[PDB]
Amino acid sequence: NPESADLRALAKHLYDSYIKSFPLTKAKARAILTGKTTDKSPFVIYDMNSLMMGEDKIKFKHITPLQEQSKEVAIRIFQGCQFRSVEAVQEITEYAKSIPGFVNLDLNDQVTLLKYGVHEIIYTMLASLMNKDGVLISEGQGFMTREFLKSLRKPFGDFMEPKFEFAVKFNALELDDSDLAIFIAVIILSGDRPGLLNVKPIEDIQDNLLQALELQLKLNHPESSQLFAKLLQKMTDLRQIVTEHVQLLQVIKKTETDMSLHPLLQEIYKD
Ligand SMILES: CCCCCN1C(=O)C(=O)c2cc(SCCc3ccc(C(=O)O)cc3)ccc21
Ligand SMILES: [Cl-]
Numbered sequence: 001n002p003e004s005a006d007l008r009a010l011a012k013h014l015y016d017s018y019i020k021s022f023p024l025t026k027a028k029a030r031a032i033l034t035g036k037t038t039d040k041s042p043f044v045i046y047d048m049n050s051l052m053m054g055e056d057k058i059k060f061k062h063i064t065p066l067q068e069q070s071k072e073v074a075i076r077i078f079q080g081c082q083f084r085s086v087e088a089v090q091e092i093t094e095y096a097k098s099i100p101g102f103v104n105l106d107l108n109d110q111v112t113l114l115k116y117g118v119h120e121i122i123y124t125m126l127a128s129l130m131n132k133d134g135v136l137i138s139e140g141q142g143f144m145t146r147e148f149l150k151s152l153r154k155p156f157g158d159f160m161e162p163k164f165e166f167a168v169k170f171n172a173l174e175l176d177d178s179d180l181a182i183f184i185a186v187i188i189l190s191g192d193r194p195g196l197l198n199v200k201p202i203e204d205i206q207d208n209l210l211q212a213l214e215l216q217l218k219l220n221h222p223e224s225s226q227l228f229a230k231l232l233q234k235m236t237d238l239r240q241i242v243t244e245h246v247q248l249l250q251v252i253k254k255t256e257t258d259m260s261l262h263p264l265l266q267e268i269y270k271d
Contacts (some may be wrong), residue, residue, distance in 0.1 A: 017098035029128050057141070064262075074257065080137075096188050109198060112194075113202070115195075134144060170237070178220060
């Protein structure tokens with residue numbers, strides 16, 4: 001069909017830019033997590049002992065020097081959790097520029113779409129690095145168990161749990177990276193974001209993106225019926241984790257007044 005080819009060439013385009021923008025794809029994460037072993041076998045951190053024992057191999061050097069070794073383990077892990085967020089935002093930003101028409105919208109809308117969109121995308125991509133037992137870290141060289149993160153000092157202990165809760169339900173849909181590329185594009189171009197000056201051009205692109213996603217899911221998963229509707233229904237789960245993420249940030253801000261934030265997050269954190 002002549003009109004379907006525009007959507008599939010659009011899917012091929014977003015898939016191509018997805019691979020170019022994100023080094024940690026779901027396919028590589030799944031290769032490490034299944035028992036294909038030898039070279040890509042990760043080191044596992046399950047308790048405070050293995051953590052110090054793995055700092056030789058875990059590359060825990062990416063912790064901010066101003067607020068690094070002096071702080072307790074619970075704050076440091078939170079610091080590394082936020083350091084993987086600046087990297088995702090940078091990559092989502094580079095990814096957003098490749099979505100056709102995005103760079104042609106108003107600048108203020110572009111900043112608005114990224115300010116509210118990156119967090120919903122982060123937890124979507126974080127699910128690719130997760131199973132029921134833990135999450136990949138250090139570019140797949142490490143694996144931090146869900147049990148150990150859950151055991152951290154409060155409220156940092158119950159901060160990774162809602163992401164693990166979302167990952168197990170989201171990973172049940174069995175989407176690959178070709179589907180996630182289009183879905184991530186749909187999340188960016190939401191016309192219902194607060195402060196959008198011109199909403200109509202944003203909705204026009206998301207129509208085209210949703211058309212591409214529905215056709216992509218029908219061809220890549222022909223046996224899974226209503227995968228389109230069930231995938232769109234899981235953003236209600238994505239806005240909830242976001243809303244409790246903003247709730248523990250203001251708690252940490254007044255509990256840990258001596259803790260810095262990366263300027264990219266401090267600007268995103270304004271709601
Ligand atoms: C994939 C898209 C962006 C994800 C951003 N991101 C979160 O938002 C989040 O909550 C979270 C939680 C962890 S787990 C504990 C933190 C941690 C991080 C890195 C290392 C390391 O040494 O590599 C060690 C520990 C990791 C990444 C996270
Ligand atoms: Cl990252």
